[PDB]
Design a protein around this nucleic acid. Structure first.
Ligand SMILES: [Mg+2]
Ligand SMILES: [Mg+2]
Ligand SMILES: [Mg+2]
Ligand SMILES: [Mg+2]
Ligand SMILES: [Mg+2]
Ligand SMILES: [Mg+2]
Ligand SMILES: [Mg+2]
Ligand SMILES: [Mg+2]
Ligand SMILES: [Mg+2]
Ligand SMILES: [Mg+2]
Ligand SMILES: [Mg+2]
Ligand SMILES: [Mg+2]
Ligand SMILES: [Mg+2]
Ligand SMILES: [Mg+2]
Ligand SMILES: [Mg+2]
Ligand SMILES: [Mg+2]
Ligand SMILES: [Mg+2]
Ligand SMILES: [Mg+2]
Ligand SMILES: [Mg+2]
Ligand SMILES: [Mg+2]
Ligand SMILES: [Mg+2]
Ligand SMILES: [Mg+2]
Ligand SMILES: [Mg+2]
Ligand SMILES: [Mg+2]
Ligand SMILES: [Mg+2]
Ligand SMILES: [Mg+2]
Ligand SMILES: [Mg+2]
Ligand SMILES: [Mg+2]
Ligand SMILES: [Mg+2]
Ligand SMILES: [Mg+2]
Ligand SMILES: [Mg+2]
Ligand SMILES: [Mg+2]
Ligand SMILES: [Mg+2]
Ligand SMILES: [Mg+2]
Ligand SMILES: [Mg+2]
Ligand SMILES: [Mg+2]
Ligand SMILES: [Mg+2]
Ligand SMILES: [Mg+2]
Ligand SMILES: [Mg+2]
Ligand SMILES: [Mg+2]
Ligand SMILES: [Mg+2]
Ligand SMILES: [Mg+2]
Ligand SMILES: [Mg+2]
Ligand SMILES: [Mg+2]
Ligand SMILES: [Mg+2]
Ligand SMILES: [Mg+2]
Ligand SMILES: [Mg+2]
Ligand SMILES: [Mg+2]
Ligand SMILES: [Mg+2]
Ligand SMILES: [Mg+2]
Ligand SMILES: [Mg+2]
Ligand SMILES: [Mg+2]
Ligand SMILES: [Mg+2]
Ligand SMILES: [Mg+2]
Ligand SMILES: [Mg+2]
Ligand SMILES: [Mg+2]
Ligand SMILES: [Mg+2]
Ligand SMILES: [Mg+2]
Ligand SMILES: [Mg+2]
Ligand SMILES: [Mg+2]
Ligand SMILES: [Mg+2]
Ligand SMILES: [Mg+2]
Ligand SMILES: [Zn+2]
Lengths: 99, 137, 99, 61, 83, 208
RNA sequence: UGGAGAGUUUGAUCCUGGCUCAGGGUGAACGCUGGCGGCGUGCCUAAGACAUGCAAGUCGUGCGGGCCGCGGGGUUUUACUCCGUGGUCAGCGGCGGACGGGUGAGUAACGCGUGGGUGACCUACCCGGAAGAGGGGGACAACCCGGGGAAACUCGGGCUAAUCCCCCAUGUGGACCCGCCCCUUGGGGUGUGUCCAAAGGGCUUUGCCCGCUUCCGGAUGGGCCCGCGUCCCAUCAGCUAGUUGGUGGGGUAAUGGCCCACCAAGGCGACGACGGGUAGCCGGUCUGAGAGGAUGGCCGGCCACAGGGGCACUGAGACACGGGCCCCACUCCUACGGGAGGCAGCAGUUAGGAAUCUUCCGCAAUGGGCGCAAGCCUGACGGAGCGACGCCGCUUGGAGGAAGAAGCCCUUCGGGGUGUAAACUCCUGAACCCGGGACGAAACCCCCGACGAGGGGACUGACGGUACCGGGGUAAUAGCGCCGGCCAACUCCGUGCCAGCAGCCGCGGUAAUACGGAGGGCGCGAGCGUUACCCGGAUUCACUGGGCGUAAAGGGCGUGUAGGCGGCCUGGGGCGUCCCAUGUGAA
């Protein structure tokens, strides 16, 4: 009747409480970073996606996400930042962009 | 037919208890039996295959009938006496299909307790007493 | 060893794609008769050079849609509109069998 | 259904196991009855087609 | 993991094993990759084993882990005997 | 268990004289003398011609009753006989003559098949120490066969080399009487293995 | 090294055509008989519901607590608190529950078989390697305390450890957007901006071993999609609106209307779309000379599901049988407040069915998982039992013994069958008893040796006191179906179109070779008849291998769409076709 393998739910909720708390910081900071690229302020979002970048690739050491998509959640961010900084954007160098 | 049966157990005063061994004289309860109904003998493996005594087959005949109290009770007596007439070893009636009054046979000759009480109390069918019919040669 | 199979253009009514059927020969596995059957293989046309009524060559690629797998590599010849009639008259022969 | 053999032992509420086949000279019958089931016992004095009509060994005396 | 073990292809009370290599996520009678060895325990047949002296170097070079009997019955074959 | 009962009964219905008792067969008391007719109280009936099924049925009896190997024991022997590559009606005869009933009996260690079947069946006649209680053994070409060392001085074996005190049996076997052994050399052919059986109308029946 | 035919329409014949039989096979069943072993198989129907037992746990070279034994100090070994070594309980954490086992309800589909692709992907424990193991902090189960709850259990205030998490220095390496070169579909390096490393433990204390992180490669297991084949019905002829296609975005490891907003009228189908019925597929199995036909019993590969449906987390790998949530139906307990829930895992119970079996023993061998090992679990499996479920093999004796004993049947009364059959002389003696005892087992574990290489030593059997060996020793089971023709085998008595046989022709009206009985004979033999299904017979769907004047058959006729084809000669392509080697057609 009883089984000692009920522990796996008590790692499932205990680690779901961590992963659910970590996955919001990718797209929340990413959409908040891509909004400021439309606003015009570049260095603010360039300060944002260093911490968001740290919360992508530093979160890529556990088991939340470390795949080719772990590179693409950052690649869509730094991809979609750089286009709209040309129509009167004055692209300076913060931390994210390499050029 | 020989099969493996045993798993011998019995009732206690309040619950069930199971025994591994059982010997002569003692009696008890057994599961796993297939089709040997009561009134029959089961013997061992290297047994002399002996059959017991007291196979109660008398031959009584009793003229009696029924009154099913309504006018459409033929289907319910014809449906209930099918499953009811199998416990009574005497079920030869030969009712002439001309009218109602579905006659049940007579074995114990006071057989309300085996047919009519087990039809009103057990099977929930109301009935009364009826009358037979003569036949001149 | 991706297969390189020749098809014919019968319709380019939808943009950025062509409706190409491929004729092929195979004997019957029981009666043994070389009969010609066809099956339409929708291919992508990014250059818009293959017009209506062409004979194209087909190479398989990574799929972009439901029911698209192939693309056009080369044209062998072109201009034979009579085979396009040899499909499309069967398109205007289906309406004569109805209620 | 058809009843084979020299008579039978059947009632109105009888459980009759069926076999099948056909009977040639009857208009609707296409079933046979195996004698040897617990409501259709075989006919006595039967020792030539004994397993076909379902009786045990005729005991000597 | 892919590793060498004994796959029993034998009848009742007549054992015969296959020194054979595939994934450990199969059953005993699984679809293997390459037949390389056989084995008869009852010692009635003098030709009771034959394990290749290059393909065992291939599978052990790409990292198969033999078990107890897959280790002793390949040790009796003599792969690691070069001195 | 192949057949137990009247065995000279099969000769009178069979026709041609059969050798299955030994001392009674070679003597003029094989019941073929003075009683030619098939058994039963019908017997000498009218001269009705047997049907074409019945003739090859009696040929199934002239291949089966003498050898004693029964029908379900026999269809498989015809099956690998047809599976072998060659004349199946000639390979099948020696193929049945590779068994420890008629290899031992053609070696002459018994007076009939009911002594070879039984004396091999109890486990006396051995293939080089490996004693075989089983006459269904397929005898290999060149197999030497001797009786048991306790069976070398029985009251029946001494009467079972009596007629074959150095008998020149044909070239499908060899024997040593003073060593009480033999050696089945090679498989016997069709005609020099001379037994009254026909070849042609057998595969015709067994293919139907 | 491969193929039977007959009965049957008619006064009689030929041809066409229908039906049946002689053969083989089953996850088969019924009846009768029944002795022993070996090897395979055992709910086909209700994928209906289930009492109870067992099937997935493991780690003290990871970590902290409670309880004992003995290692002990102001020990009355009550010692309560110093001390401390091994079990037990529970917890954090790592790995395995995606392996293995069972079923085919659903699915007509890239689901499956076959062959590839990925420039559109992953791969932990396996192996080859370039590096590392330095800092700080934090909380949660466990005990300290309290509450609630009949209970299972649950809720609050602090505590520390771990190989749990967070923040750093290091960045050889990898990743991201732009521009460069050989290939152009997202595949390889260079340059800068940023980001990402960890973890320690044990012993004999670095001599070593077990573990961890970035990354490269090779095996192995997977995901996706394509060419081909994939039941029947047209009395199912139009179907479809994320349906067809692009642009941009979100999600998956990865392409894809997988999902969303706009743009457009598209997409498929008489080469059978759509709709309905049926069905897991294949290697295989049965039959057949072959081509074919039926089917997916055991075993193996894949797919679908775990009472029906929907959904996500953890996990590399699941949308997960014994993991989680909700609805539906059902069972059980209740201190009538709330819970446990899912045997289509093994064995068993019940309903249904004619039909399907042990709540048997064990980790002795393999395999799977954990641990450095010692060892743990294995209803996978290794073995017996039950049921002649199928096959194989064997016994129920042997040699002699009469012109025919006795009993039984027929007779025209002589005789004939039973019949060498029986008793008798001799022999082997299956069962039965006594004694012995197995391959399956040498590995894991230690010793020498340089922790590898190599050699040596030690433990272990449910089967099983069984198979088997050496002797002694009893002649000791037999039935089933048929007997007019197909197709093997006939006399008498009673029945007089009644009882009955029956696959067909068809019999039984006082001589029934067709019924019941007696005898005899035939075929098989621990098996024989019967039923249901499949193939062949059947060329009776004809591709090999048929017809269309009269047996069934040419549309009432013509034009004409699609299709199938198609005069002569020359040249090219090598698509169809043929040949050679290889991959592959697993087992
Ligand atoms: Mg536990
Ligand atoms: Mg070794
Ligand atoms: Mg050695
Ligand atoms: Mg006798
Ligand atoms: Mg006519
Ligand atoms: Mg089923
Ligand atoms: Mg258990
Ligand atoms: Mg401790
Ligand atoms: Mg414990
Ligand atoms: Mg699970
Ligand atoms: Mg299965
Ligand atoms: Mg459908
Ligand atoms: Mg390693
Ligand atoms: Mg290193
Ligand atoms: Mg510190
Ligand atoms: Mg307390
Ligand atoms: Mg470094
Ligand atoms: Mg360095
Ligand atoms: Mg780098
Ligand atoms: Mg790089
Ligand atoms: Mg630069
Ligand atoms: Mg820069
Ligand atoms: Mg690791
Ligand atoms: Mg296809
Ligand atoms: Mg769709
Ligand atoms: Mg996934
Ligand atoms: Mg189905
Ligand atoms: Mg098939
Ligand atoms: Mg599934
Ligand atoms: Mg479900
Ligand atoms: Mg259920
Ligand atoms: Mg579930
Ligand atoms: Mg499972
Ligand atoms: Mg069960
Ligand atoms: Mg057990
Ligand atoms: Mg073990
Ligand atoms: Mg093990
Ligand atoms: Mg098993
Ligand atoms: Mg058995
Ligand atoms: Mg005799
Ligand atoms: Mg004697
Ligand atoms: Mg004696
Ligand atoms: Mg051990
Ligand atoms: Mg030492
Ligand atoms: Mg060694
Ligand atoms: Mg050694
Ligand atoms: Mg024991
Ligand atoms: Mg033992
Ligand atoms: Mg005697
Ligand atoms: Mg005849
Ligand atoms: Mg007849
Ligand atoms: Mg045929
Ligand atoms: Mg045919
Ligand atoms: Mg015709
Ligand atoms: Mg006419
Ligand atoms: Mg006509
Ligand atoms: Mg035309
Ligand atoms: Mg043409
Ligand atoms: Mg031409
Ligand atoms: Mg040319
Ligand atoms: Mg080609
Ligand atoms: Mg194969
Ligand atoms: Zn004779």
């Amino acid at each position: 009747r009883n089984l000692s393998a009920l522990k796996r739910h008590r790692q499932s909720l205990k680690r779901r409480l961590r992963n659910k708390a970590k996955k919001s910081a990718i797209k929340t900071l990413s959409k908040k970073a891509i909004q400021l690229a439309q606003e015009g302020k570049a260095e603010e979002a360039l300060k944002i996606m260093r911490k968001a970048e740290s919360l992508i690739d530093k979160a890529a050491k556990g088991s939340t996400l470390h795949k080719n998509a772990a590179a693409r959640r950052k690649s869509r961010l730094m991809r979609k930042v750089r286009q709209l900084l040309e129509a009167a954007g004055a692209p300076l160098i913060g931390g994210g962009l390499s050029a | 037919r020989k099969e493996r049966v045993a798993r011998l157990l019995r009732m206690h005063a309040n619950h069930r208890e199971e025994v591994e061994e059982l010997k002569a004289g003692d009696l008890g309860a057994v599961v796993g039996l297939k089709e040997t109904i009561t009134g029959d003998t089961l013997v061992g493996e290297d047994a002399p295959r002996v059959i017991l005594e007291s196979i109660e087959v008398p031959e009584p005949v009793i003229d009696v009938a029924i009154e099913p109290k309504t006018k459409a009770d033929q289907e319910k007596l014809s449906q209930a006496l099918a499953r009811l007439a199998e416990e009574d070893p005497t079920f030869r009636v030969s009712t002439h299909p001309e009218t109602g009054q579905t006659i049940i046979s007579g074995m114990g000759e006071l057989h309300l307790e085996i047919i009519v009480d087990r039809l009103k109390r057990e099977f929930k069918v109301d009935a009364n007493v009826g009358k037979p019919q003569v036949a001149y040669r | 060893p991706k297969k390189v199979l020749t098809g014919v253009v019968v319709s380019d009514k939808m943009q950025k794609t062509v409706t190409v059927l491929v004729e092929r020969q195979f004997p019957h596995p029981l009666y043994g008769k070389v009969i010609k059957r066809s099956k339409k293989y929708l291919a992508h046309d990014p250059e818009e050079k293959y017009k209506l009524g062409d004979v194209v060559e087909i190479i398989e690629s990574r799929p972009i849609s439901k029911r698209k797998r192939f693309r056009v590599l080369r044209l062998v010849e072109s201009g034979r509109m009579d085979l396009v009639e040899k499909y499309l008259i069967r398109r205007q022969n289906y309406e004569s069998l109805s209620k | 259904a058809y009843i084979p053999g020299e008579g039978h032992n059947l009632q109105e509420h009888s459980v009759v196991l069926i076999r099948g086949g056909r009977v040639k000279d009857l208009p609707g019958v296409r079933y046979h009855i195996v004698r040897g089931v617990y409501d259709a016992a075989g006919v006595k004095d039967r020792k030539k087609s004994r397993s076909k009509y379902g009786t045990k060994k005729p005991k000597e005396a | 993991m892919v590793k060498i073990r004994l796959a029993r292809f034998g009848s009742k009370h007549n054992p015969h094993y296959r020194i054979v290599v595939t994934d450990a996520r199969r059953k005993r009678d699984g679809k293997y990759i390459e037949k390389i060895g056989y084995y008869d325990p009852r010692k009635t047949t003098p030709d009771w084993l034959k394990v290749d002296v290059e393909r065992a170097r291939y599978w052990l070079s790409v990292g198969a882990q033999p078990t107890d009997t897959a280790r002793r019955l390949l040790r009796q074959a003599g792969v690691f005997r070069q001195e | 268990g192949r057949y137990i009962g009247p065995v000279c009964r099969l000769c009178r219905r069979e026709g041609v004289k059969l050798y299955l008792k030994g001392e009674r067969c070679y003597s003029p008391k094989c019941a073929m003398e003075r009683r030619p007719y098939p058994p039963g109280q019908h017997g000498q009936k009218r001269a009705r011609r047997p049907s074409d099924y019945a003739v090859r049925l009696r040929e199934k009896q002239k291949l089966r009753r003498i050898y004693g190997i029964s029908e379900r024991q026999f269809r498989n022997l015809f099956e690998e006989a047809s599976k072998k590559k060659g004349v199946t009606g000639s390979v099948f005869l020696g193929l049945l003559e590779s068994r420890l009933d008629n290899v031992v009996y053609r070696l002459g260690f018994a007076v009939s098949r009911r002594q070879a079947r039984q004396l091999v069946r109890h486990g006396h006649i051995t293939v080089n120490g490996r004693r075989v209680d089983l006459p269904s053994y397929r005898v290999r070409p060149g197999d030497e066969i001797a009786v048991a060392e306790k069976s070398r001085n029985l009251e029946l074996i001494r009467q079972n080399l009596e007629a074959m005190k150095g008998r020149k049996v044909g070239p499908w076997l060899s024997l040593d009487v003073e060593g009480m052994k033999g050696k089945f050399l090679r498989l016997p052919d069709r005609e020099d293995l001379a037994l009254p059986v026909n070849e042609q109308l057998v595969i015709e029946f067994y293919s139907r």
